[PDB]
Every structure is written in structure tokens, then in C-alpha cells.
């Protein structure tokens, strides 16, 4: 006979949350990845200096002169950050993150410019030789959709 204004408006806010759910869920993940990136960076300094001073990429965190323990460079969504031959990889925690990005990671690596180096940011990579890395293809890479426009670099970016 009457009461449909309360029933529809409670059910439009319910469906509004369902539509606002995936937007906040990638905005959210995309936000948790933007930090793995900040934790990865700022460690470029150590790695850059080590390379320019010696001409060899730092083998591990200790070589680069950073928390000798990967797990000591963690965060809220970051379970750690390891330096492996100049390549700095950031791992996403398992608690406090999206759902399709946890335990997932990215990498920052550089290239000899000769007198200086240039840095790249993208999906996990392994270093082959002092001037070549390759996709750490394995299945734990953070999905392209969660990576900034500034971190879409490919293993062979120059």
C-alpha cells in the first residue's frame, strides 16, 4: 500500500556499495603497489653508488650497504626488498593487501650509461650480465593493471 521509498533507497545504497566495491578494490591495490615502489626506490642510491664506485653491481643488500636482511626493508604491504646483483625487488606482504597482488613483486634495475646509470621500474627481472637482465618469469609478478604508468618498463628497456 505504501512503504517503498525506504526499501528502494536501502537497496540502492546496497548496490551502490557493490559498484563502488571494485573501484576501491583496484584503487586500493594500485595504492599498495605504489608503496612497494617507494620502498624499492631510495635504495637506488646505495646501488648506484656501489656500481659507479666499483663498476660491479652490488650482489646483495649488505654489499649495497643496506639492512643486511631483506626482511628488514619491509612495510605495511611490503614483506621485503632484496637487492640481487643491482636489481632491487619488492615483495608484497600477505596481510593487509588487495587479494590478487599479495606475495607478488616488482623490480627496479639499472643500466650503465657510462659515467652514470639510468633506472627502470617494472615487473620482476633477473640480472644476466652487468648490462642485461631478463623477466623473472615465474607467476608472482604484480599484474600490469596494478602498476603505475611510470613502472611499465620491459626487461629490454633502454
Amino acid at each position: 500500500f505504501t512503504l517503498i521509498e525506504l526499501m528502494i533507497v536501502i537497496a540502492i545504497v546496497g548496490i551502490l556499495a557493490a559498484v563502488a566495491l571494485p573501484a576501491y578494490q583496484d584503487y586500493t591495490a594500485r595504492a599498495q603497489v605504489s608503496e612497494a615502489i617507494l620502498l624499492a626506490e631510495g635504495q637506488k642510491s646505495a646501488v648506484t653508488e656501489y656500481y659507479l664506485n666499483h663498476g660491479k653491481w652490488p650482489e646483495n643488500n649488505t654489499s649495497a650497504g643496506v639492512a643486511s636482511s631483506p626482511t628488514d626493508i619491509k612495510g605495511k604491504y611490503v614483506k621485503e626488498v632484496e637487492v640481487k646483483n643491482g636489481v632491487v625487488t619488492a615483495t608484497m606482504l600477505s596481510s593487509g593487501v588487495n587479494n590478487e597482488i599479495k606475495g607478488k613483486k616488482l623490480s627496479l634495475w639499472a643500466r650503465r650509461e657510462n659515467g652514470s646509470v639510468k633506472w627502470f621500474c617494472g615487473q620482476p627481472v633477473t640480472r644476466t650480465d652487468d648490462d642485461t637482465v631478463a623477466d623473472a618469469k615465474d607467476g608472482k609478478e604484480i599484474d600490469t593493471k596494478h602498476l603505475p604508468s611510470t613502472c611499465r618498463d620491459n626487461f629490454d628497456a633502454k
Binding site: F1, T2, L3, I4
Partner: protein, 314 residues
């Protein structure tokens, strides 16, 4: 466990007692008459039992106490207050008006969650839904805004349409609540209700054995509508002068050709009691059925809907 009686049936019987008692019949004879004129057995049966206590000398209030499931504590106390103060006649008139208002109010919620409730939600928002539907067919309609305004301003500009919807609602509510210079032309005259009451009262006093003229003198003092009271004083004055009852009635528009033709047969047959009882029950049933209560709905129904649509259009 026992139930009361219907709102209709309390009504008829409280009216017809108030009428007989205010006529100066003895209370037991009043009681006998309404029992003997009743159509349902349960009424005729009780009223014989209420009368049986009154002939043992008990008050009407104390006699009705044998049926507390039918006459509640508030009813008896009104009777007993009338009996204690010497106003039994005027408290029965009050109770008859009360019972009439109660039955009318009952029919009139219930009529059409039942069906009336579901149909009344459904009619009250039909239009205002259509309206929100045409105004949700996109953006840049008549009177809107663009969606990028700030919400509060957007909602306040549309206030026009939110208002035209509420007014639409208030209207269909009014039609559902109501609905269940020639100075004399402006006065409320006799209605269907007032003719039904008159006819029942007269059917009642004639079936009991009062003459026509004694019944009319009582009725002319207990008629609520002033114009009808003036009509009935003229009918009684005409009859007392020796004019024939059907001829005093035929002068007044409120009595159809048939009411008069039927009364005119009753005069020649000595069956005016039977005639008036069947006239009254015909009228009482016409009353409770009751066509302009549905046409004026629809006038305001679509007329308001259309006023909204035109409102933002402009």
C-alpha cells in the same frame, strides 16, 4: 468465548432504541419492538433476554450487562449515566450517533494489508513513480541540471519536481481519506442517510403499533437535518389536517415517485408498517453500498500527474 455483533447490526439496533425510547414508549415495549423487527436471530434472541431482565425491574444498563461481549463497559456506563441522571433518551441518541459513526468508519477503512491497503499504496505512488521514471531517462531534460553540479544545488533546483510529486501524493491521499446569490440553494438538505434513518424510525414505530401521527410527532423532534425537520413538520401538519400521507410526501423532492406510490398502496391496505420496513431496508443497503466518489478520484488522479509533467516541462 463469545463474540460481539457486527458494527452494522449494533448500529441499527441502537438507532431504533433511541428512537422508540425518545417516543415515550415504555422501555420494555421499546425492547419488544426492536426484537420483533429484527432480521438476524442473534439480535432478536438477545433482545428478548435484555427485555426479560428489564421486566424483572433491572435498569437497561444492568440488563445489557448479560451481554458484556456485545455492549462493552463504556456503552453500559453511558446507558447507566443516562438512567442515573434522568437523561436515558439523550444518551441513547448519543449512543445511536456513536454506533453510526463507528459502522461508517469501519466500512470505509476496510473498503478496497488487504485489497484496500495494497490498492491504496499502489495508487498513491503510481504517478510519482512514472514521474521519477521520465525524469531518470537521462540528463538535460526540461528543468533538470547537469550531473556535475554539486549534489545539494542539483537537489534544490529539482525541488520543483520533488514538490509536484508530494502534492500528487497529498491529493491521492485526500481522495482516499475523504472518500472512504440564492442562499436557500446553499443549505445542506436531506441526504440518503437522513431518509434511511427517517424510514427506519417510522417503520419501527408503526410495526410496534403507534399510529402514523404519533410516530410523526416523535420523529419531527428526533430528525437531525434542519431542512428535513422543516419538511417533516409540514408533512405532519398536512396529515393532521386530513390530507393523505402519500400526498403530504409527494410535495417534497426527497421522496421518489415510488416511495410515494408504495406509501400510497400502504395507506389503502393497512400495511404501512410492512411498506416502511422494506423501504427502510432497501435504503439502508443503498446507503452502505454508497458513484461520484470514484469519478472525482480519477479527476485528481491524472490531473495531478499531468500537472507535474507540465510543471517541469515549462
Amino acid at each position: 468465548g463469545f463474540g460481539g455483533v457486527e458494527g452494522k447490526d449494533i448500529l441499527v439496533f441502537t438507532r431504533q432504541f433511541a428512537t422508540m425510547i425518545d417516543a415515550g414508549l415504555p422501555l420494555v415495549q421499546c425492547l419488544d419492538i426492536l426484537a420483533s423487527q429484527m432480521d438476524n436471530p442473534s439480535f432478536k434472541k438477545v433482545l428478548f433476554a435484555i427485555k426479560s431482565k428489564v421486566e424483572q425491574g433491572s435498569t437497561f444498563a444492568d440488563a445489557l450487562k448479560e451481554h458484556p461481549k456485545v455492549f462493552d463497559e463504556l456503552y453500559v456506563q453511558l446507558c447507566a449515566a443516562g438512567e442515573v441522571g434522568g437523561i436515558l433518551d439523550a444518551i441513547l441518541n448519543r449512543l445511536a450517533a456513536y454506533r453510526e459513526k463507528n459502522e461508517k468508519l469501519k466500512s470505509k477503512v476496510k473498503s478496497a494489508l488487504v485489497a484496500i491497503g495494497v490498492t491504496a499504496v499502489l495508487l498513491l505512488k503510481v504517478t510519482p513513480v512514472f514521474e521519477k521514471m521520465f525524469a531518470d531517462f537521462g540528463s538535460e531534460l526540461p528543468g533538470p541540471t547537469q550531473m556535475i553540479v554539486n549534489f545539494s544545488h542539483m537537489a534544490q533546483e529539482y525541488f520543483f519536481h520533488v514538490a509536484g510529486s508530494i502534492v500528487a501524493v497529498v491529493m491521492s491521499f485526500t481522495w482516499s481519506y475523504r472518500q472512504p446569490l440564492f442562499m436557500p440553494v446553499f443549505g445542506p438538505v436531506l441526504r440518503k442517510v437522513a431518509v434511511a434513518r427517517f424510514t427506519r424510525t417510522l417503520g419501527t414505530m408503526i410495526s410496534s403499533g403507534v399510529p402514523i401521527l404519533d410516530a410523526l410527532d416523535v420523529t419531527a423532534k428526533t430528525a437531525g437535518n434542519r431542512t428535513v425537520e422543516d419538511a417533516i413538520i409540514y408533512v405532519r401538519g398536512k396529515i393532521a389536517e386530513g390530507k393523505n400521507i402519500a400526498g403530504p410526501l409527494a410535495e417534497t423532492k426527497v421522496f421518489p415517485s415510488m416511495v410515494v406510490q408504495m406509501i400510497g398502496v400502504g395507506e389503502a391496505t393497512g400495511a404501512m408498517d410492512t411498506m416502511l420496513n422494506k423501504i427502510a431496508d432497501f435504503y439502508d443497503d443503498e446507503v452502505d453500498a454508497a458513484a461520484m466518489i470514484e469519478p472525482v478520484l480519477m479527476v485528481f488522479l491524472g490531473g495531478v500527474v499531468g500537472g507535474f509533467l507540465i510543471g517541469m516541462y515549462l
